[PDB]
Structures are given as structure tokens and as C-alpha cells.
Ligand binder design. Sequence first.
Ligand SMILES: *NNC(=O)c1ccc(-c2ccc(C(N)=O)cn2)nc1
Length: 9
Amino acid sequence: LAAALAQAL
Ligand SMILES: *NNC(=O)c1ccc(-c2ccc(C(N)=O)cn2)nc1
């Protein structure tokens, strides 16, 4: 989950 969101950066 973190990675899925983190992609924004
Ligand atoms: N918001 N951007 C990111 O989080 C992000 C962009 C690109 C990459 C990345 C990682 C690894 C490679 C490689 N060829 O090993 C290339 N680009 N990470 C994060």
C-alpha cells in the first residue's frame, strides 16, 4: 500500500 501511494513522488 505505501508503495502504491508513494509513486506520486
Ligand atoms: N515519484 N516518483 C517515484 O517515486 C519514483 C520514480 C522512479 C523510480 C525509479 C526507481 C528505480 C529505477 C531503476 N531503473 O532502478 C528507476 N526509477 N523510483 C521512484
